[PDB]
Amino acid sequence: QMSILEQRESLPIYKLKEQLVQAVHDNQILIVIGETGSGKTTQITQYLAEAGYTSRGKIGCTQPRRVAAMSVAKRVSEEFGCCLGQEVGYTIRFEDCTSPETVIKYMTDGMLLRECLIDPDLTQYAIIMLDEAHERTIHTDVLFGLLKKTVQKRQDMKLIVTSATLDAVKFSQYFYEAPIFTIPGRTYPVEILYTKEPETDYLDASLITVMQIHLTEPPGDILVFLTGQEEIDTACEILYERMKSLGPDVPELIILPVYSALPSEMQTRIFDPAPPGSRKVVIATNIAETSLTIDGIYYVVDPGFVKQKVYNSKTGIDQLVVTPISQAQAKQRAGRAGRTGPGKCYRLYTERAYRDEMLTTNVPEIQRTNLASTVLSLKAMGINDLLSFDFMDAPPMETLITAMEQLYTLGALDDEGLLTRLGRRMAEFPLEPMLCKMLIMSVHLGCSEEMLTIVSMLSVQNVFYRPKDKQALADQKKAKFHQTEGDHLTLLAVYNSWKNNKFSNPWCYENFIQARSLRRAQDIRKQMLGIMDRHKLDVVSCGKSTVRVQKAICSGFFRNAAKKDPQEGYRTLIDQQVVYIHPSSALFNRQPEWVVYHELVLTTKEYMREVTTIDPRWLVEFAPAFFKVSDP
Ligand SMILES: Nc1ncnc2c1ncn2[C@@H]1O[C@H](COP(=O)(O)OP(=O)(O)O)[C@@H](O)[C@H]1O
Ligand SMILES: [Cl-]
Ligand SMILES: [Mg+2]
Numbered sequence: 001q002m003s004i005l006e007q008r009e010s011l012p013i014y015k016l017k018e019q020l021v022q023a024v025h026d027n028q029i030l031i032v033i034g035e036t037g038s039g040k041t042t043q044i045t046q047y048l049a050e051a052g053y054t055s056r057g058k059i060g061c062t063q064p065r066r067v068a069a070m071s072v073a074k075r076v077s078e079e080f081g082c083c084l085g086q087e088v089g090y091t092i093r094f095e096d097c098t099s100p101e102t103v104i105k106y107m108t109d110g111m112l113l114r115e116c117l118i119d120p121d122l123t124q125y126a127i128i129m130l131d132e133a134h135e136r137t138i139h140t141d142v143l144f145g146l147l148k149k150t151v152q153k154r155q156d157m158k159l160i161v162t163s164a165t166l167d168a169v170k171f172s173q174y175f176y177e178a179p180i181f182t183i184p185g186r187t188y189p190v191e192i193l194y195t196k197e198p199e200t201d202y203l204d205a206s207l208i209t210v211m212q213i214h215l216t217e218p219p220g221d222i223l224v225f226l227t228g229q230e231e232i233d234t235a236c237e238i239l240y241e242r243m244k245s246l247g248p249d250v251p252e253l254i255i256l257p258v259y260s261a262l263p264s265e266m267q268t269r270i271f272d273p274a275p276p277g278s279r280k281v282v283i284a285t286n287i288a289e290t291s292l293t294i295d296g297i298y299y300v301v302d303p304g305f306v307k308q309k310v311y312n313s314k315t316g317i318d319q320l321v322v323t324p325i326s327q328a329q330a331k332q333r334a335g336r337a338g339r340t341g342p343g344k345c346y347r348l349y350t351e352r353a354y355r356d357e358m359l360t361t362n363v364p365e366i367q368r369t370n371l372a373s374t375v376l377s378l379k380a381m382g383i384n385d386l387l388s389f390d391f392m393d394a395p396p397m398e399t400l401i402t403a404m405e406q407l408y409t410l411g412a413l414d415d416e417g418l419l420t421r422l423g424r425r426m427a428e429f430p431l432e433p434m435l436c437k438m439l440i441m442s443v444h445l446g447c448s449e450e451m452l453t454i455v456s457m458l459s460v461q462n463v464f465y466r467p468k469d470k471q472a473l474a475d476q477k478k479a480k481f482h483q484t485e486g487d488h489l490t491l492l493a494v495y496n497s498w499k500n501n502k503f504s505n506p507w508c509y510e511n512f513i514q515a516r517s518l519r520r521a522q523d524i525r526k527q528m529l530g531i532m533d534r535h536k537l538d539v540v541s542c543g544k545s546t547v548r549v550q551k552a553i554c555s556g557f558f559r560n561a562a563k564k565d566p567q568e569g570y571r572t573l574i575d576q577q578v579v580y581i582h583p584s585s586a587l588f589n590r591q592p593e594w595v596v597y598h599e600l601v602l603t604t605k606e607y608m609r610e611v612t613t614i615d616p617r618w619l620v621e622f623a624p625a626f627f628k629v630s631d632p
Helices: 004-009 012-026 040-050 066-080 109-118 138-154 168-174 202-216 229-244 264-269 327-337 349-354 370-380 397-410 421-426 433-442 448-458 471-479 487-500 505-511 513-533 547-560 617-622
Strands: 029-034 058-063 090-092 095-097 105-108 124-132 158-163 180-183 189-193 221-227 251-257 279-284 296-304 306-312 317-325 341-347 563-564 570-572 577-579 594-602 605-611
Touching: 004 066, 004 105, 012 029, 012 040, 012 180, 029 040, 029 168, 040 058, 040 105, 040 158, 058 109, 066 105, 066 264, 066 547, 090 221, 090 617, 105 109, 105 448, 105 577, 109 138, 109 370, 124 138, 124 341, 124 487, 138 370, 158 168, 158 349, 168 180, 168 397, 202 221, 202 229, 202 296, 202 341, 221 570, 221 577, 229 251, 229 279, 229 513, 251 264, 296 327, 296 605, 317 594, 349 563, 370 421, 370 433, 397 421, 397 433, 397 547, 421 433, 433 448, 433 547, 448 487, 448 547, 471 594, 487 505, 487 513, 487 605, 505 513, 547 594, 547 605
Parallel strands: 029 158, 029 180, 058 105, 058 124, 090 105, 124 158, 189 341, 221 279, 221 296, 251 279, 296 341, 577 605
Antiparallel strands: 090 095, 306 317, 563 570, 563 594, 570 577, 594 605
């Protein structure tokens, strides 16, 4: 109702409070099932803290995304009555908002995985809650295996797994036929509306649908499912313009973006109720399917797309791609319009496309991703017999062999498949293996000062400010930073000139650089420097000898080597695929014979992102294992 306490007592889980703490008391492992918004994430930790479980250790609860971990920790600290970071806190990659006071901790799946490396028995925890398998992430499958082992060694610890009705028995059977606790909940009818014919521009169709709902449908807030941040920011801008073009005699539409890189002040706005005579539209990614729960939503706009990872078994390369959602996802999206009353779901696709062009459920992430990082993490924990690891959704044998082969050519593993000194040092950093490799190699190549900066700059969102109205001016400002040897050295030049200008916000404004992004890289750099210092890895500058930087990049990213094609674009060394230097690259107007790129991004063309010029001789010098029978 009105107060926080009344709001907490109106949640479906409240009716089962006593029986829930009794079920936890009676069972070491409990599978918890309940409709999204029933209070599983926010209340279970509080119920158990009240029952006295924090006296024995921390209560940890995993979250799949940054915005979810931050959002729930903030809400739970308000309900608990403490400071965020004190009794209730959160941990995400590069941001640990916890203290010696923390008894309730929300963390990303990846952060719990990093704690297992330090302490495989998770001795600091009395309770571990593994919050769902919304989409069965690699981290969920890995944490299930690690905690099935932890539960055997630790008879005192409690394990709570939240689940979907369809997954509950599979999770139960996995956890030694663990009991299932069901939170009954009211689900309301959702009118499902399909398009008569397929829509070309799903972004335009979704904006048209939002405006039609707003002006002609009874009060209730709208939830739009888009594919990413850039798309979301674009949707918001166009909708704002379109709504303003209607003039002042039109009811207010509160346009609210939702993405994992969202500033916290904008995150709180999505939970605020709309004032009378106004309506809000929440433009979100698939975080809004199960992770974030907004009250007052009665309308869902479903264009039918998710950005997910697709793996190539032959090349061993994975890539983010926009594909249709599974039917299970369509059902989850529609269900968001039926939580507090009957609602409507506008599917921007035909009924035939739902029944024929959509998979029932998606393939689990562990079966369509590169597993080099997973294998490196597992080997760092002493798990050498990968065939013995009890996975719920088993990865293909080919993917595990490809992962081993990749780490071996990186120099992380030996012939027997055991970690080398290199692999061990690589495992100490919360980074992708090719990034770890170039950082440890920069120590031996005498450019770790530069590499700490480059790795930190590569770990942040675009630092170049490019407003739609000042695109030509933005490019001229950026061109001043352009280094002849590529994008990585341009990132280094941006950071160093910012440092040399005493980390000035006005300098950033003048040069069209995002100060927030540089402050994030600065913070990441300090944390990476902390790991280097702990493990006595020397921090050395190359000075003017930036060829050392290029070699270190090449020692990690040789797999992404590509040679300039005489006709157009480039051809990858690995599979002779046609790839291109992006128009935003420092190398766009000075395309060299050989390059290495950070990643491939599919837009209109298959574009290389973050390109550095290389000498092909360095491929033999830094990746000799990666080359079969040639002379020269
Ligand atoms: N940051 C937040 N601010 C305000 N309310 C929130 C926040 N995060 C969650 N809530 C509210 O908490 C309630 C309980 O949700 P939750 O614990 O996430 O349920 P479940 O985990 O079962 O899906 C929801 O009705 C939701 O609106
Ligand atoms: Cl209560
Ligand atoms: Mg939840």
